[PDB]
Amino acid sequence: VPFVEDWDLVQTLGEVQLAVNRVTEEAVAVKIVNIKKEICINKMLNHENVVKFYGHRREGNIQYLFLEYCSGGELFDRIEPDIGMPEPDAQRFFHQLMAGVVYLHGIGITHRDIKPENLLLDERDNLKISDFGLATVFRYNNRERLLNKMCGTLPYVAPELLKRREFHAEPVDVWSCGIVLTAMLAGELPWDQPSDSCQEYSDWKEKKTYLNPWKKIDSAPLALLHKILVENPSARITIPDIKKDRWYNKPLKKGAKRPRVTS
Ligand SMILES: Oc1ccc(-c2ccc(-c3[nH]nc4c3Cc3cc(O)ccc3-4)cc2)cc1
């Protein structure tokens, strides 16, 4: 099959470029560059809510990561500033985020930088966790390794990452998912960082939910955020319990409209 291995770089996505196959016209994302770990972790991954890794090629000092193209773009761009998005859309995206995070944690991988810029959407609006550049193995040979490195983006980091020397990996990803859920429902980030010097963070711990972003959020998803955004990571809700929450299991969204005729 001649020219089947030839890909044309047609546009920049985020360096990340959209590549189109010369013969088949298949669209892929290619990332051009810690890096050895990123490729290793990517080779472990296979899930419908995790951006697919096709392979890698090294041209001297440049690494080319061949990854799944997500035409829907970033979840970030589905969030209307100060508004968010319809609650059924946010619930569906939150379900898909949980399936992807359950998968990652199940194989002992923590993403460490979950935010809407890293949550991509395919052609059918299916959420895909992306960018495994900060990701690490927290469970190996069924032995959990406690983390100590500062990783992430301050508005999304769990408070234990700033207060404690060591912390468990899984509650940190759970916390950032709750900040993502907040962003989806209110179109704003609740604080700059989860610290006592942050008035907004201090107000949330004081249960001042009559303030923004919380007053824009319905009591059923807000009750879930009350269980996720818990300062003590040991008292914080786990994903198996998130899956039992009332809003998580609340019927809200119809399926993808399917073509139909009458009479
Ligand atoms: O380890 C990594 C590192 C990076 C990624 C990765 C994989 C795919 C993409 C990608 N695929 N499709 C898109 C993007 C960015 C984007 C941004 C847009 O505004 C629109 C589309 C896309 C971007 C980054 C996945 C795993």
Side-chain angles (χ1 to χ4, degrees), residues 2-4 6-14 16-29 31-33 37-51 53-56 60 62-148 150-162 164-256 259 261-263:
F3 329 123
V4 76
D6 300 331
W7 302 82
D8 303 302
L9 310 174
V10 302
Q11 72 172 102
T12 287
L13 304 166
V16 175
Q17 277 181 93
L18 165 58
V20 178
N21 191 266
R22 185 182 158 177
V23 167
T24 77
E25 284 170 83
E26 284 159 333
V28 302
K31 178 182 187 265
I32 288 93
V33 177
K37 195 196 221 182
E38 184 164 2
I39 291 159
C40 180
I41 286 163
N42 264 299
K43 281 160 144 178
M44 288 175 74
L45 314 174
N46 178 49
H47 194 265
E48 59 268 32
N49 296 112
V50 172
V51 174
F53 178 78
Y54 305 123
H56 66 287
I62 304 146
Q63 276 275 5
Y64 298 94
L65 274 79
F66 288 76
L67 303 144
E68 167 178 20
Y69 172 63
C70 308
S71 65
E74 299 179 356
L75 179 66
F76 182 87
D77 294 305
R78 304 300 183 87
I79 307 172
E80 185 182 8
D82 211 47
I83 305 298
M85 74 183 64
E87 199 174 298
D89 298 356
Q91 192 198 51
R92 176 182 170 274
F93 291 137
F94 191 72
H95 290 162
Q96 298 177 349
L97 180 49
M98 289 302 108
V101 175
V102 168
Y103 168 73
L104 290 182
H105 289 178
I107 61 166
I109 289 170
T110 177
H111 186 277
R112 306 207 283 186
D113 201 19
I114 301 169
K115 52 181 173 178
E117 301 84 342
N118 287 340
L119 305 168
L120 310 184
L121 298 178
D122 70 5
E123 60 285 352
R124 284 184 164 177
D125 269 9
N126 288 318
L127 184 141
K128 317 271 180 165
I129 300 174
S130 86
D131 197 337
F132 286 88
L134 299 197
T136 198
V137 187
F138 74 90
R139 194 195 309 106
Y140 197 86
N141 289 329
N142 201 43
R143 273 295 285 175
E144 181 179 5
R145 183 175 70 91
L146 292 169
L147 302 178
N148 58 68
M150 304 297 250
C151 286
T153 306
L154 280 169
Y156 301 90
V157 293
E160 61 267 25
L161 186 141
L162 309 169
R164 310 303 183 176
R165 188 180 60 91
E166 298 186 299
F167 43 87
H168 289 273
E170 293 166 290
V172 172
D173 285 339
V174 163
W175 177 279
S176 56
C177 288
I179 302 296
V180 166
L181 179 55
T182 306
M184 295 201 284
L185 294 175
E188 77 171 289
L189 295 172
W191 40 72
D192 296 339
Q193 47 192 69
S195 53
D196 304 307
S197 59
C198 217
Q199 182 67 71
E200 291 84 9
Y201 183 59
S202 197
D203 291 344
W204 163 255
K205 295 201 291 175
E206 283 181 79
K207 301 224 189 69
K208 298 187 192 174
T209 55
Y210 51 90
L211 301 173
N212 281 325
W214 321 109
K215 56 165 146 172
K216 296 188 261 175
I217 305 178
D218 184 75
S219 69
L222 188 50
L224 178 56
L225 292 165
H226 272 294
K227 297 178 286 175
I228 299 176
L229 305 176
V230 161
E231 174 148 64
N232 181 355
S234 304
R236 188 173 312 153
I237 198 169
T238 63
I239 307 172
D241 283 343
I242 289 172
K243 278 171 174 191
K244 301 170 192 141
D245 165 84
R246 193 186 70 188
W247 179 76
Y248 191 92
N249 285 299
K250 202 187 158 171
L252 296 177
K253 207 169 176 174
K254 305 273 159 193
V261 294
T262 55
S263 279

